Design brief:
One of its GO terms (cellular component) is extracellular region. This protein is an alpha/beta fold. It contains seven helices and five strands.
């Protein structure tokens, strides 16, 4: 449900094939928030409970509304926190394909992490999905240093955070359908395109 720590809790001797690291939006609970469980259930259907570890970014990521105003749209302490989960993934389970996602502040956190990540771990992320990406206009729909074909951005018409603002309007809260169909679909498809472990 809203907290999943499958990578922290997982046994290295029994590595899943796919690890999803997800960062939640502002003020959301647990470490998955309102969209993370939906995507998680569908990935579990595609690969089985033991084929996929779902890991949310917790620890120092507080998902404080105010940090959207910071230079990268998130605190440096949250970037260090997600960066460390990508590095735990790569060390615990080197053969696993990674996938990532984020909503609102977590889409800006997912883009800032991936931009700073070591290239050999970044290249292991077969697909990333961003919902209501606060840096969409600034970054022209891309995550820096990361292929356009592996990125999918869900930005609703009228979601002001997609169009250079930080005003939260109603379309910003309307990504439940996407998290239920299109986004797991894109992720399962990018993972099957390269394969698993």
């Amino acid at each position: 449900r809203t907290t999943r720590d499958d990578l922290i809790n997982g046994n290295s001797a029994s590595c899943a094939d796919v690890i999803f690291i997800y960062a939640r939006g502002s003020t959301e609970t647990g470490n998955l928030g309102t969209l993370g469980p939906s995507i998680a259930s569908n990935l579990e259907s595609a690969f089985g409970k033991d084929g996929v570890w779902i890991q949310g970014v917790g620890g120092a990521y507080r998902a404080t509304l105010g940090d959207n105003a910071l230079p990268r749209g998130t605190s440096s302490a949250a970037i260090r926190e997600m960066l460390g989960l990508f590095q735990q993934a790569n060390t615990k389970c080197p053969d696993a394909t990674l996938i990532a996602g984020g909503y609102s502040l977590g889409a800006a956190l997912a883009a800032a992490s991936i931009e700073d990540l070591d290239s050999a771990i970044r290249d292991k992320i077969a697909g990333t999905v961003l919902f209501g990406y606060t840096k969409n206009l600034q970054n022209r729909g891309r995550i820096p240093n990361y292929p356009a074909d592996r990125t999918k951005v869900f930005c609703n018409t009228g979601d002001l955070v997609c169009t250079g603002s930080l005003i939260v309007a109603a379309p910003h809260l309307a990504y439940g359908p996407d998290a239920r169909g299109p986004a797991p679909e894109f992720l399962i498809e990018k993972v099957r395109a390269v394969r698993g472990s």
